[PDB]
Amino acid sequence: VETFAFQAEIAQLMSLIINTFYSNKEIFLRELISNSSDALDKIRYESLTDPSKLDSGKELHINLIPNKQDRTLTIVDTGIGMTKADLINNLGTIAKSGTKAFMEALQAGADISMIGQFGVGFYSAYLVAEKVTVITKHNDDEQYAWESSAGGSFTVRTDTGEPMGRGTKVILHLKEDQTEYLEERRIKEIVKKHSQFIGYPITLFVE
Numbered sequence: 101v102e103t104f105a106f107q108a109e110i111a112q113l114m115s116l117i118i119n120t121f122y123s124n125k126e127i128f129l130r131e132l133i134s135n136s137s138d139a140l141d142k143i144r145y146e147s148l149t150d151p152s153k154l155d156s157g158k159e160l161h162i163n164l165i166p167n168k169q170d171r172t173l174t175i176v177d178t179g180i181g182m183t184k185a186d187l188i189n190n191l192g193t194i195a196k197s198g199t200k201a202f203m204e205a206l207q208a209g210a211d212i213s214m215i216g217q218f219g220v221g222f223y224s225a226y227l228v229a230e231k232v233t234v235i236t237k238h239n240d241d242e243q244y245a246w247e248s249s250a251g252g253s254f255t256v257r258t259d260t261g262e263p264m265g266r267g268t269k270v271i272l273h274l275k276e277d278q279t280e281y282l283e284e285r286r287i288k289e290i291v292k293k294h295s296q297f298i299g300y301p302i303t304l305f306v307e
């Protein structure tokens with residue numbers, strides 16, 4: 101298991117997300133679903149010039165899986181997945197500018213719900229999660245597990261769990277007072293409100 105420090109600006113953003121009083125927490129789901137849709141768009145486009153990229157799975161979709169026993173909500177997609185370089189360096193590097201812009205906008209009247217306009221919506225996960233675990237598999241790379249409970253660091257390890265094929269699974273370990281996001285009717289409500297026109301099947305599992 102390797103431990104890494106977040107870029108300072110991203111640590112700052114995460115602390116803001118964790119510490120700011122902001123009741124409209126449900127927007128985390130729209131942001132994660134949007135990121136999944138983006139990843140699905142990417143593999144779809146790439147498969148047009150190289151159809152073998154779908155040898156790891158032709159189905160392009162999103163599953164939402166709540167688990168009350170584990171207190172987790174998992175957002176699964178069969179998108180392009182992430183390389184080790186994506187996890188450690190790339191996604192944090194590209195998020196730098198967006199983080200700065202977002203934090204500046206907040207000082208000038210914007211609110212946290214606008215976070216996706218700056219390309220850093222993933223971090224809204226920390227509105228509801230005490231810990232986020234991300235399992236990911238990109239073609240031509242190994243399956244990885246990324247994990248962070250904030251506090252300025254994240255880990256990455258090669259994942260010896262059940263093979264995914266291709267895509268990304270974001271596992272939200274929900275805060276004690278955020279268990280509403282495990283309820284069928286609540287998730288349905290949020291998807292209908294914010295994610296109605298996503299261009300991929302979204303299947304909400306029940307318990």
Ligand SMILES: Oc1cc(O)c(-c2nnc3ccc(Br)cn23)cc1Cl
Binds near residue numbers: 135177182191267270
């Ligand atoms: O399918 C996906 C779904 C996602 O939420 C993400 C994603 N977007 N931003 C980040 C930041 C860190 C990690 Br670890 C995953 N991210 C990336 C892919 Cl590839």
